[PDB]
Amino acid sequence: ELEARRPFPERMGPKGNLIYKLITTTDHKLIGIMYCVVCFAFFLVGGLMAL
Amino acid sequence: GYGNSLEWATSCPPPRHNFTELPRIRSERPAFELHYPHMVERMRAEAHVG
Amino acid sequence: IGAPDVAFPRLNALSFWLFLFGALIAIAGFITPGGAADFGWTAYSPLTDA
Amino acid sequence: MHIEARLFEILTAFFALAAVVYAVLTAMFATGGVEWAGTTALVLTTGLTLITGTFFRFVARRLDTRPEDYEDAEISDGAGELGFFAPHSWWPILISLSFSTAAVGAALWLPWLIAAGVAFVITSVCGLVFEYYWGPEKH
Amino acid sequence: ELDLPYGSALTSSGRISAVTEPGELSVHYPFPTMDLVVLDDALKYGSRAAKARFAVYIGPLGADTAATAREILANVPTPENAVLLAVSPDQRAIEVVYGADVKGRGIESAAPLGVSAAAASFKEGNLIDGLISAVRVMSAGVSPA
Amino acid sequence: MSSTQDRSQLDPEVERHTGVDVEDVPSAEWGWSHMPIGVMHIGGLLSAAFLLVMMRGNHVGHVEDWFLIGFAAVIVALVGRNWWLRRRGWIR
Amino acid sequence: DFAKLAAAQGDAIDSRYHPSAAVRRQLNKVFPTHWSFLLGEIALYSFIILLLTGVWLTLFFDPSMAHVTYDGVYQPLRGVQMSRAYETALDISFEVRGGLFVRQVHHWAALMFAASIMVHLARIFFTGAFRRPREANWVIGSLLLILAMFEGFFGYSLPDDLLSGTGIRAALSGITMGIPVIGTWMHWALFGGDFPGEILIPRLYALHILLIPGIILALIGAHLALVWFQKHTQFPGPGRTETNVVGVRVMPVFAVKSGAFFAMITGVLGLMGGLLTINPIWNLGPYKPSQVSAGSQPDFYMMWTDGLIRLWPAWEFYPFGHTIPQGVWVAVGMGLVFALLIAYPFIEKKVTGDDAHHNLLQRPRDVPVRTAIGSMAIALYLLLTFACMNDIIALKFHISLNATTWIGRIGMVVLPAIVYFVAYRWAISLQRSDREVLEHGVETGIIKRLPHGAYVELHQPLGPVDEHGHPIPLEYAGAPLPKRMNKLGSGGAPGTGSFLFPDPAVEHEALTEAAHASEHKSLTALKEHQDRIHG
Amino acid sequence: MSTALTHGLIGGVPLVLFAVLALIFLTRKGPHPDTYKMSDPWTHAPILWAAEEPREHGHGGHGHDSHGVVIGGGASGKW
Amino acid sequence: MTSAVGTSGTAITSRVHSLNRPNMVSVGTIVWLSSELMFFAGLFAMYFTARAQAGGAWPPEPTELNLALAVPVTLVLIASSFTCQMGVFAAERGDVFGLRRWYVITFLMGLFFVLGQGYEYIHLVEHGTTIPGSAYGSVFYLATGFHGLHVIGGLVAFVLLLARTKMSKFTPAQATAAIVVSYYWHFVDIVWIALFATIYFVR
Ligand SMILES: CC(C)=CCC/C(C)=C/CC/C(C)=C/CC/C(C)=C/CC/C(C)=C/CC/C(C)=C/CC/C(C)=C/CC/C(C)=C/CC/C(C)=C/CC1=C(C)C(=O)c2ccccc2C1=O
Ligand SMILES: CC(C)=CCC/C(C)=C\CC/C(C)=C/CC/C(C)=C/CC/C(C)=C/CC/C(C)=C/CC/C(C)=C/CC/C(C)=C/CC/C(C)=C\CC1=C(C)C(=O)c2ccccc2C1=O
Ligand SMILES: CCCCCCCCCCCCCCCC(=O)O[C@H](COC(=O)CCCCCCC[C@@H](C)CCCCCCCCC)COP(=O)(O)O[C@H]1[C@H](O)[C@H](O)[C@H](O)[C@@H](O)[C@@H]1O
Ligand SMILES: CCCCCCCC/C=C\CCCCCCCC(=O)OC[C@H](COP(=O)(O)OCCN)OC(=O)CCCCCCCCCCCCCCC
Ligand code: HEM
């Protein structure tokens, strides 16, 4: 009558599971996350210019 | 809570292919109807009052 | 919208990489000795010609 | 696809009106007659939306009311075989890299690099298109 | 049958689509995130050597503590090779249970050691630290099948 | 369906019982999969030291030295972060 | 009567000698049919082309520094003092029919020889074709690569030229003469005196037509004999074990395809010799110490040494009344590079501990640390190679020359680390992809489940399927997995008529049924052999 | 105007504002429940935690069946 | 692997059942072609601005259009569009080889159009007019040569689709691919009709 869950969710994940996804990513969700991270990196790069 | 737009009808990390289910889509708030069935009548009653 | 994926999911992957690499080669103007583009974002005609 | 077609029909109506009024008010009441840039751009964005809306209307008349278009459509109604959505593929990044090579070759006027980039673009587009059609190796 | 007090609905399939009010959380565990992470690290890879599913049950295990421990172990996904450490502070009780596949791998010898570590830490006043210490000791004791 | 499963018995010979595990590197038994972390830490530290040492040279320039400083600093920061996290058990 | 003549000649051969058993062994020898195993054959064929063109070139080349005024046919260099080597190279280019083509295809064959040696080295290193057995084969192959590098170095330096003579002055003279204890002595022994000594080109000609090519031929013979009698290793597969070679026999298939590959490789080399201009020595005036160009690069195989020279940060030491120039740094760097390359298999075995007799290759993904190290080394080599080209890179791609130099300097410690980390994680993620394919089947198009709106990719299991939908996961066997139903029996039977018109339905059905039967027969034969071996 | 003053202002006002806002916000009780004290009664619902450590046949639920609890020992303690 | 978990005879199939639903590939192609229309709109704007700013004699004295070579090429492009539509009909049927024949002759006629455009380019360059030579020359070359690049892209698409049909069995997926390639070719010939009417007749 009770569920066996983890004390905390997996923090990061096993070595070598994302690098190949990014190259071969075809899930819109992962691509959207790649957009957000990469786009935000350009925000910092472009924002540094304003400073 | 009280979310809508059908993206909240799935696990917070969405399953690959976004869904294991789909609720009855009736209005612009499928997830609100899914989570609060009692409001379904209310959302229609007060809709036009504005 | 309740869909599992975008219409052309290899295409949207190409769109991201075109964005990333297209963006980088624009930033690449800085590493050149002259620098990036002098003309403003608008890049008006006479100031932009060779 | 009635609403999908009607959206583009409305856009076509508005853009045609804008193109016509711009052309008239620029042929007369402008310093040098018709602008010939805004006029052409407005005419051909009217053409853009007109092509899209005409195709959507053709499809709407060709197809019976889909569950998606049908209000009061149950999930089971649309439940069935969705088509082939491409799984993981590393050809998009190669296409982007090839087009970036061609683009830098165009920027830095290097005809050799432009040719190499175009060859790589052809190769990578061929790879992407043939990805799910390259039959098993026949030895 | 009744779903959560508010906002949780049974869906077309078995899964229950639940909601939480915007300001509040879902896990509601009464432990620091870092200590929960440390315990998860233990259970996850400090037990990989044991190759036996290590489980922790902080809930109250009343009546016959041994038997309630037996059935909460049964509730573990793979009780065949599993080691469940149950702590009830409402009863100040520890109970460790093991699967049949977890036999003769040093588990039985490690049982008193793990329970002693847990008890020492608890009397010091650290439930989570005691759980981690017990998990570490038991994992060190247990040998892979 | 037109594919046959593969049976492989490669000769094995460290026994992999210490170091990396299949859960972390699925093909741990199939080849060299573990580089000691000390090796990578010392390599990063020596790379940073080499970058800093290249500042001493016959160049009147200064942006070169600043680039060396920045790259050495980020290398040392990464090495320190990794070492600290592993010391504490991959925390924070 | 060709059949009668062949039978009579066979009887004569088997009477004079008795080669029946040995010849049958050679013909029946089985060679794996993997494409990556033709990479060494590329180098072998390029070497053969090099020999054939080099004989022709030696028939016309005159090695000497004896000064001469051209008085030839090439007008832009007339009355200019030049060495006999340069004069006869110009004569080959202009006043000998097909001489320009022969020398161009020779140089292109040299470039392909180096490139294919490099690619073959990559293949063997990444697939682990050197451990326990074949480690000596790797060692002699490393010696062969070094010899090829220096052979090309002496080759493109053979026609005394402005570019190549400048390269000689840099490397052979400066590096040799900077070496602390014996540097000047080695320089004088090699050059018969000061740098422009009147024996350098004759000595290099000897070294390049007879001495070094003789050693290369001997080492290639040893290499091929070792590969022949230490049966070629193979990738893990259905019927492939550590105690068998699955492939095709020498006579019917392997021999014909190897000969055809040789034909195609020499065709590529000839096409490049025709269409692509290589080393226009006529453009590159005769060597004069006072003259120089801006390019000043060696061939791509020595480009990494030149890039090391460029990038290394001008560190010189001055002991008591002595100098230790920066040339010694690059010399020691090259020594370390070659020592590590030659001694890697022994280094790898000392580190890991594996001395087991390995006959089954391992996919580069299956060995993350070694593929990571190889990627790191290739990244460093590419960094050095482009550092040597920083001059033209800066010129064409508008980047300041100092910026390119310092990009190389910083990268040669940053880029190797980045590539190591990326390659390690990439290999592990390829392993993870293989495991996910094993445990879930191949991916396909999405389907919406009937009762509810669940979306499922509708995978296809690669093994026995459990009573319910999910399959029994398979165990990784060191062999590639099909990640596209494309490559399985799915949508692969187009009308077998022609490109423009169909064929009769009876013929098409016969052909496709026969092909399907052949595929079934091959797969069943592999399956039964695998079962017999492992049971 | 007062080059040093302007530099100090642009470098400090952001820092002062950041410090003030951090004192205001980062020093507020978070939504994470406070650590459970041993003295206090255990009010939270039962918490069973599992490692997810080993491989479990196939991910598919069906076919697992219920072989049995198959107990393999015991232990006890009272702090 | 009993038979297959995905009961499909093609590893790749139509992205949605097109009988009851819109063809996603066709929809995307139509939208992208509508965008390429705006690209050519920018080119047309350039040309029309140059025309407006010309001082009466829009084609300068050195330049002289060759209708003798411009009418055959546009007629050949119209014929190519007709043959492409015939190939589309073949693809709608299961006629793999009929589609291949129609698309091969379409590719040949498109290549003939490209070669004719190149010949007219060579003749024009010889007779003075050049991209740097004059504003008319430059706008004309930009417009018509970007269209020629689009035609070359269509030729590449044709050969690539034909290779795909060779390598895999004909299915609704390949039929739709042929349909969208034909949509691109029809768009190319339509923009060519516009460019011809503008450059040559309207001037
Ligand atoms: C030692 C060292 C590496 C110093 C750093 C200098 C350097 C190489 C910088 C990069 C060069 C580039 C890519 C310049 C373009 C501007 C730039 C930096 C843009 C941003 C780069 C970036 C991350 C872009 C994102 C997408 C991406 C990966 C784009 C890459 C684009 C390119 C140029 C790809 C090809 C790489 C390439 C060929 C670089 C030049 C290297 C060489 C040695 C070319 C040799 C070569 C030359 C030089 C000829 O002139 C020539 C003339 C006629 C026929 C043949 C050739 C020929 O083969
Ligand atoms: C203006 C001017 C002078 C122009 C000319 C340029 C010039 C100077 C020279 C080039 C001119 C020439 C002569 C070019 C052609 C070179 C040549 C001999 C090409 C042969 C290819 C050809 C014509 C094939 C025809 C198609 C056909 C029927 C092929 C099957 C029958 C044939 C020819 C089989 C040949 C088999 C073959 C390549 C034997 C090579 C012998 C050698 C050296 C090694 C054999 C060998 C091989 C090949 C391995 O791969 C191997 C792998 C692992 C372990 C051991 C071995 C091993 O021992
Ligand atoms: C199996 C072998 C296959 C090989 C096929 C061979 C291809 C043949 C190419 C075309 C014929 C060559 C004619 C020889 C006459 C000739 O040399 O060709 C020049 C052109 O040259 C250029 O620009 C480049 C033009 C672009 C097209 C050719 C590019 C081919 C490359 C891509 C093939 C090699 C592979 C390289 C891959 C690299 C990519 C890496 C990713 C043309 O004159 P021009 O243009 O005026 O030369 C200027 C001087 O005058 C002036 O001083 C000087 O300043 C310059 O401006 C010079 O250009
Ligand atoms: C472009 C890149 C540069 C070119 C790269 C090519 C050069 C070769 C590459 C890498 C060499 C370094 C490898 C890493 C060495 C590992 C060190 C260690 O800590 O030892 C652990 C091992 C595992 O033992 P285990 O029972 O599995 O226990 C698991 C414990 N966690 O022990 C041992 O057997 C071995 C101990 C001694 C090893 C000595 C190896 C080097 C010999 C001198 C050759 C020069 C090296 C040049 C380095 C660049
Ligand atoms: C073994 C590998 C060999 C390599 C990598 C190699 C490489 C080269 C290269 C790159 C050149 C420059 C050609 C030019 O600049 O036009 C050259 C020249 C030459 N090679 Fe070799 N070669 C090899 C073997 C041989 C052999 C076996 C011979 C004689 C049979 C030979 C004879 C010559 C001659 C005479 C020249 C001078 C041609 C000239 O000055 O244009 N080479 N070599």
UniProtKB/Swiss-Prot annotation, chain E:
The keyword Ubl conjugation applies. Transmembrane segments: none annotated. There is a cross-link at residue 103 (Isoglutamyl lysine isopeptide (Lys-Gln) (interchain with Q-Cter in protein Pup)). InterPro entries: DUF5130. Keywords: Isopeptide bond, Ubl conjugation. This is Uncharacterized protein MSMEG_4692/MSMEI_4575.
